[PDB]
């Protein structure tokens, strides 16, 4: 029963082995702790928005949406319908990016490594959509607490439709290479089995719940934007192993394609940010021609908007599970407290339970199926 | 509504059992995966020939910063210090004083490119379109010091890129 | 793509699908990089009259949270935080995979 330290995303893992089996596995975190929650207190809400892209850098617009929803709830305002549809459309696109990344990285860690390139081509195309709308490929800062920053370019919906009508073949090729493979099945089936009661008590969320047979989804039970206006199915597992969660992620990719099609078909006209110049900055022409617009632009970009005092906990169904923000405001233009709840924290906490009586090579598979990105874990 | 992903019961008749045994013994799915890889081998790769071919971009792209100026030749910056106040990373340092003719102008305008996060807040907080985030992205450096831009470097960047900077601004200013 | 017929048949047989129907490389079917100017319609609060700000200001409508059972100050049926959720339906589009 020897103890070994797998040292330096990047992770340190101290584990005891009795031969081939794993006795105890303790993960050490803090290698990517930068102190985001403390730096937020020294910035205004708009200045604190970009931190959430760095939070979970595989799913960025989802973090933006969570923070924007929290600030909107505190502000007692709502965005225009077109902004909500853009948020939902982009959120679905981001979910695809996150699921592609997770599945391909898990396969590459196992050793497949071909679907990684096959689907990173599509990830590059998605980066372009992110780039066309906001000028940034990854750290977009597109979604703001008033809606979105800018309207879509005139040729974006057609390109999104053209891209999204050929993605099903990419998913089919991924499933062909992975789903029915006997080596992949032997690597994943009956690995890291977690019961429904343990998954609930251990604070798991997202696929880790849905993989165990629990019928829970925040987009269905507690819709936030335009979700109650789009129809989609929720994949549910039956064994709680890695294979069931992989199948759930693939089916979630397909349902994301479904929601993207619905959002493209049902796009409404109108403005893209709330018509409240005391919260959302006015247009440049209005700023350069109107006195009130100039005053409000000055005050919004220098001091910011004051949020009424109060504490809220806003949670959304991010691609990695329930992503939440507990925001406490004292009435000023700077948040008093911003606690971030990331599903990776609870998942990595339960890793030790989920890796009981498994081989050393099984720990890599379990970590891959947890969908762990340490930016959100460490914050 | 919800779906089941792994709720299929395999058939237990002789034909299905024989088919599964044949799959196990002859490796049909492995051959199918090999055929998929072979089919993917015979199609055109997606690689572009950098640096002779460049990836597509858009007018909204954020790159290396620049300071623009009016057509008459006077710099647009008026030392309002909005970009400094809105910078999330505190990468902008501004010092100003009245000029020889009494115009409100800057004496120091520094951007620390190693602190900047390229969020574009500075170019959208500017009321006179003075500071812009240009479209250049190939400006790597061999030393840390040369990434600490001062007013002269930013003005040189503006004079160098003004053509396509103004073209992009003209193309995109109706969305702002 | 610029592929010969024999290679196309080989790829279609090996993969099992029609590759040329749905290619993964973008061609002239994409939109042009030069577009006409937009117009971007104004929002709902751009009226010239009957648009006083005190009637459409969300922030000042926020109130401090209501207090029930401050310690410093009948059948009585038992209650729940919300009615129990209804059972989900089995997705009558593709119930099983």
């Amino acid at each position: 029963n020897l103890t070994l330290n797998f040292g330096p995303g990047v992770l340190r893992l101290v584990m005891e082995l009795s031969g081939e089996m794993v006795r105890k596995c303790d993960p050490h975190i803090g290698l990517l702790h930068r102190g985001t929650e403390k730096l937020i207190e020294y910035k205004t809400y708009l200045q604190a928005l970009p931190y959430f892209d760095r939070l979970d850098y595989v799913s960025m617009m989802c973090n933006e949406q969570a923070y924007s929803l929290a600030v909107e709830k505190l502000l007692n305002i709502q965005p225009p319908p077109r902004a909500q549809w853009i948020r939902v459309l982009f959120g679905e696109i981001t979910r695809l990016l996150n699921h592609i990344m997770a599945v391909t990285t898990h396969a590459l860690d196992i050793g497949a490594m071909t679907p990684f390139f096959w689907m990173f081509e599509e990830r590059e195309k998605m980066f372009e959509f992110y780039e066309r709308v906001s000028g940034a490929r990854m750290h977009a800062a597109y979604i703001r607490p008033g809606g979105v920053h800018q309207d879509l370019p005139l040729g974006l919906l057609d390109d999104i439709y053209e891209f999204s009508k050929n993605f099903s073949f990419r998913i089919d090729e991924l499933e062909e290479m992975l789903t029915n493979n006997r080596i992949w099945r032997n690597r994943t089936v009956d690995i890291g089995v977690v019961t429904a009661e343990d998954a609930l008590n251990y604070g798991f969320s997202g696929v880790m719940l849905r993989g165990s047979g629990i019928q829970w989804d925040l987009r269905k039970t507690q819709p936030y934007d335009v979700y109650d206006q789009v129809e989609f199915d929720v994949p549910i597992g039956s064994r709680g192993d890695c294979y069931d969660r992989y199948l759930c992620r693939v089916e979630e990719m397909r349902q994301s394609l479904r929601i993207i099609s619905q959002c493209l078909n049902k796009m409404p006209p109108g403005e893209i940010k709330v018509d409240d110049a005391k919260v959302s900055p006015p247009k440049r022409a209005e700023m350069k021609t109107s006195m009130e617009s100039l005053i409000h632009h000055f005050k919004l970009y220098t001091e910011g908007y004051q949020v009424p005092p109060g504490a809220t906990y806003t949670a959304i169904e991010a691609p990695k599970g329930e992503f939440g923000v507990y925001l406490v405001s004292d009435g000023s233009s700077r948040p008093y407290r911003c606690k971030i709840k990331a599903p990776g924290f609870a998942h990595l906490a339960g890793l030790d339970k989920m890796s009981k009586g498994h081989m050393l090579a099984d720990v890599v598979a379990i970590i891959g199926t947890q969908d762990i990105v340490f930016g959100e874990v460490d914050r | 509504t919800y779906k089941f992903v792994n709720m299929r019961e395999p058939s237990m008749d002789m034909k299905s059992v024989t088919d599964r045994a044949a799959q196990t013994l002859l490796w049909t799915e492995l051959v199918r995966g090999l055929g998929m890889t072979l089919s993917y081998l015979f199609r055109e790769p997606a690689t572009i020939n950098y640096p002779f071919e460049k990836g597509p971009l858009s007018p909204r792209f954020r790159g290396e910063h620049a300071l623009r100026r009016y057509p008459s030749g006077e710099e647009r910056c008026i030392a309002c210090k909005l970009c400094e106040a809105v910078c999330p990373a505190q990468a902008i340092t501004i010092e100003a004083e009245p000029r020889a003719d009494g115009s409100r102008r800057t004496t120091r305008y520094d951007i620390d490119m190693t602190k900047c996060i390229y969020c574009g807040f500075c170019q959208e907080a500017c009321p006179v379109d003075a500071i812009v985030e240009g479209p250049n992205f190939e400006f790597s450096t061999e030393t840390h010091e040369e990434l600490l831009y001062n007013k002269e470097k930013l003005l040189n960047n503006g004079d160098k890129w003004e053509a396509e900077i103004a073209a992009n601004i003209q193309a995109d200013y109706l969305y702002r | 793509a610029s592929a010969t017929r024999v290679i196309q048949l080989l790829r279609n047989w090996a993969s099992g699908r029609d590759l040329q129907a749905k290619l993964q490389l973008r061609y002239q079917e994409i939109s042009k990089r030069t577009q006409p100017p937009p117009k971007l319609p104004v929002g709902p609060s751009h009226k010239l009259s009957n648009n006083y700000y005190c009637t459409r200001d969300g922030r000042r409508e926020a109130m401090p949270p209501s207090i029930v059972m401050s310690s410093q100050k009948t059948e009585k049926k038992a209650v729940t935080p919300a009615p129990p959720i209804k059972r989900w339906e089995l997705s009558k589009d593709q119930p099983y995979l």
Partner: peptide, 29 residues
Amino acid sequence: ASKVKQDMPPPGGYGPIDYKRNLPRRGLS
């Protein structure tokens, strides 16, 4: 004067988008 012009789907909407899994059987007993 000029009329409102922004990104909207074309009249009649977009075409059907395939999302169902397509895993065929090559065929041999």
